[PDB]
Design a protein around this ligand. Structure first.
Ligand SMILES: CC(=O)SCCNC(=O)CCNC(=O)[C@H](O)C(C)(C)COP(=O)(O)OP(=O)(O)OC[C@H]1O[C@@H](n2cnc3c(N)ncnc32)[C@H](O)[C@@H]1OP(=O)(O)O
Ligand SMILES: CC(=O)SCCNC(=O)CCNC(=O)[C@H](O)C(C)(C)COP(=O)(O)OP(=O)(O)OC[C@H]1O[C@@H](n2cnc3c(N)ncnc32)[C@H](O)[C@@H]1OP(=O)(O)O
Ligand SMILES: CC(=O)SCCNC(=O)CCNC(=O)[C@H](O)C(C)(C)COP(=O)(O)OP(=O)(O)OC[C@H]1O[C@@H](n2cnc3c(N)ncnc32)[C@H](O)[C@@H]1OP(=O)(O)O
Lengths: 205, 205, 205
């Protein structure tokens, strides 16, 4: 029961809402969660929202299951960082003799992989910078610029985004993180969708 | 004197500057002032700058008059709020049996109506979140994101937007909030525009 | 050795990378450094990125040499401020008798000149407000909004953009702000690019 997570467009007669996993499974250094979707801004597929991702750099992008991603969201990978131990001007880029000054792989600054947990909600037009980690259950307010990691089930926003408030009490959150319902076989998930939606899934255990 | 506030396009040989009342009164749950205008960013009419406004949630939008609205300014109504008591994933939205979980009105969080006073100036590309009240005579810096209320004659800006400073001494402010020149027939505002542009209407009155 | 600074497009066959100077020289009240380039977002020339710049207001824009300006960057000049001693509403703009109230120049808030130092890197979609100074060797994080000055060799970011951390120890900077390699006769620079790229230039000079 439910949609088919392998369909590019699960909603029939709708080419705005798309399932990410299908779109990005041909990609290298990219992992996506089963039911995570993207609500297109101008009909663009989400692969076009991932900027500066070069396999050479080998930075990997991970997105968990059941993620609600708003339109315009932009994931900036490590491709666009400039060498900064000195002048940030890319001489090597203009040839005519400057090609020799090509940077060395271990000379480019790499901030790590971008990892997004499960059940995360990302508002529209959010910009996620490199090497950022967003824990499960997090909610990132629209038009935010995520520069540092976000703790699970935290409400974060602004530019630079900051943790505004905890979604639930420490306890509940610990429970939830431990429970990990997004990691259940669909049959079960399908049966408690309501409790998952009202957070009582905890109490039945 | 002055243009007829009922004219969509006040200035001739110009489909860029538009009086909003005319345009937006073709809408449910929207109240617009008389001389409030919108400076188009690419020709688009302002009604298109209002997102997720669904009559069913019954949230309304009100805009005083003599408001200067920069281009690209965006208003965000309650139509995009996800349920948050539990998981933020819109199961119901995918059908195929998940429809049953469609959230009940009393379950979606509605932050309230969004109210923007008179003589309010909003910079370009500003984003306004739901249920936010903005004060009479306030200036909102370009590129701000308004998540909380702003007091009258306050200068605010940032992401999130913060009150930066007051525009005039409390005294002067208390007065203008008293006089409310914007509520006067135009035949009158007409012969004081000068005492209004230089804040001297406070002494005539 | 190196590309010709008088070429709009220094990279044969490429219409995205463009040297700012040969493009903006035709404009009055604009000063640009020789090797400063702009990475076009959608193929547009940089001049489209400078807004509300009226010669009459006589404000000027200044960009040093060897600057790496990113795509989408937007520089806003002073033709965008409204009078603020009274109402922020532009009565004169609508004419039909209101032209009377055109504001005199000394009445318009003019914040001053915008000056971008040398060897400065500005990330994508950074918006620069009027009358700001950005020091040499500074670095501005993408999606920032510059509302105030920025000391040299400072890494800044946010909205409002804030200085985050000095790129190097004072020592280095002082010598750096002293050597002024961007001011050297090219051919000398051609022989020290490597030294400039890793900051070892200090040691020699
Ligand atoms: C695929 C899809 O996503 S579908 C639709 C597209 N979606 C969007 O754009 C979703 C965005 N929704 C939001 O951003 C919403 O602002 C609040 C994130 C979900 C979103 O929090 P709420 O539960 O309602 O909290 P609330 O309104 O009370 O805000 C709490 C505090 O945070 C502040 N706040 C709100 N937004 C921000 C922000 N971006 N940065 C910092 N603080 C913020 C408030 O000012 C308030 O201040 P206070 O605690 O000092 O009094
Ligand atoms: C339809 C139409 O509106 S027509 C044109 C389109 N218009 C626009 O984009 C309008 C935008 N104009 C602005 O945003 C302008 O920045 C200042 C809002 C109107 C706009 O204030 P000013 O009177 O000139 O104040 P000033 O320059 O001195 O700034 C005061 C302080 O606020 C800070 N500031 C400026 N912008 C911001 C901001 N967005 N957030 C926080 N602080 C800010 C300054 O850094 C300064 O700091 P300090 O007090 O610690 O020293
Ligand atoms: C022409 C061209 O430009 S080519 C490509 C187009 N380019 C772009 O978009 C370039 C943008 N690159 C960046 O913005 C990059 O974020 C960091 C500016 C260059 C860019 O700094 P780094 O050396 O790597 O520093 P680092 O990652 O450690 O960040 C340091 C601190 O600043 C914070 N930070 C990062 N971005 C921001 C920001 N915008 N505002 C405030 N703080 C920020 C971090 O959270 C961190 O916090 P902490 O000190 O408390 O722990």
């Amino acid at each position: 029961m439910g949609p088919n997570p392998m369909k590019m467009y699960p909603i029939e007669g709708n080419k705005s809402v798309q399932f990410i996993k299908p779109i990005l499974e041909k990609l290298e250094n990219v992992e996506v969660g089963e039911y995570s979707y993207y609500d297109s801004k101008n009909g663009e597929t989400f692969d076009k929202q991932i900027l500066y991702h070069y396999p050479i750099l080998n930075d990997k992008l991970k997105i968990g299951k059941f993620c609600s991603i708003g339109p315009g969201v932009t994931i900036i990978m490590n491709g666009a960082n400039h060498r900064m131990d000195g002048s940030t001007y890319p001489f090597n880029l203009f040839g005519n003799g400057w090609e020799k000054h090509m940077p060395k792989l271990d000379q480019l600054p790499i901030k790590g992989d971008t990892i997004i947990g499960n059940d995360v909600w990302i508002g529209k037009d959010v910009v996620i910078m490199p090497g950022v980690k967003i824990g499960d259950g997090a909610i990132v307010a629209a038009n935010s610029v995520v520069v540092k990691d976000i703790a699970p089930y935290m409400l974060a926003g602004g530019n630079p985004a900051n943790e505004i408030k905890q979604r639930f009490d420490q306890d509940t959150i610990n429970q939830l993180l431990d429970i990990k319902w997004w990691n259940w076989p669909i049959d079960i998930i399908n049966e408690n969708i309501d409790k998952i939606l009202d957070n009582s899934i905890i109490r039945e255990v």
